[PDB]
Design a protein around this ligand. Structure first.
Ligand SMILES: [Fe+2]
Ligand SMILES: [Fe+2]
Lengths: 185, 179
């Protein structure tokens, strides 16, 4: 953490966490959370088996998408829980622009990618709190409580994955909203 | 102003759940209400704890059990994190940061929980530095679950070969409490 002092403007790249951790998408919720608890890191980058960055696992994603399934954490691969596609902003974004992105999506952290598209870090509300106005911080906090990230289907990439519940309120599957797509997970 | 008592900004319209409610049912309540902090009461009306997202990630997931098989009494922050209603927001901030919390209960003189106060509530009256402090402490520190029997030891996780929490045991050698 490079000390920089408060400034109205600030390039995300300069304040993001370059020492982020990446986990495989088949990692269980149990094993992923062990990593979070151990490192006191509540945001992990998720890659598929070919090295593609496919999502981001956060605390809220676990509370919103894992718990409702009502299964043991060692029985659910994080691919079914992570925010996907991976939430992200460009490394040259000002903190203000990053704030707007997080708020628009109800997030409190996202990945940062460089021009060629590589994930170079993770930026959180904590990171941003040193530069954002108090009003901007409250906005992100309120948006995170009230809004949920829109997860897109990995099969057609266009449809929105919506939850399908049963009589117990359990999430049986998340189903692609795309009429032309028949995907469920 | 340089002053503002928490009672004025707290949320007096909060949700309370029984301590035998499963993590599954408690989370469904939180998800449906978009309120990620519940006050927990026992079967005798006593406020015994506060269930937060972090308490679930730290004290539920590691047990590797279905959400409907674990009662929140074993997950919630306990003893209940709290501040008096006459506390200045700066004092509430110090309390949260000292405890690695982002929210806590507010009690009146008699001692009953009258509301819940969150970082979002405080964000409108705290300095930028204090807000950052609370965020840093919530990430770096975790609430200390003081032992209810000896009152001085702290309940520590006891793991099996898989790294699963079997029980939380008091750190006090002179004490034999565990849950
Ligand atoms: Fe689809
Ligand atoms: Fe003890």
């Amino acid at each position: 953490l490079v000390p920089r002092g408060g400034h109205m403007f600030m390039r995300v790249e300069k304040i993001m966490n370059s020492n982020f951790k990446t986990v495989n998408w088949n990692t269980t919720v149990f094993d992923a959370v062990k990593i979070m608890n151990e490192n006191h890191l509540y945001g992990l980058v998720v890659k598929d088996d070919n090295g593609n960055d496919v999502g981001l696992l956060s605390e809220r994603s676990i509370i919103k998408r894992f718990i409702p399934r009502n299964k043991k954490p060692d029985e659910v691969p994080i691919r079914l829980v992570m925010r996907k596609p991976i939430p992200k902003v460009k490394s040259d974004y000002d903190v203000k622009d990053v704030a707007a992105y997080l708020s628009e999506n109800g997030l409190e952290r996202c990945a940062v990618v460089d021009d060629p598209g590589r994930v170079v870090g993770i930026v959180t509300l904590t990171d941003l709190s040193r530069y954002l106005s108090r009003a901007s911080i409250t906005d992100i906090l309120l948006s995170h409580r009230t809004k949920d990230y829109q997860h897109l289907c990995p099969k057609c990439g266009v449809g929105v994955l919506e939850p399908v519940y049963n009589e117990k309120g359990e999430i049986k599957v998340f189903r692609c909203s795309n009429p032309a797509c028949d995907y469920e997970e």
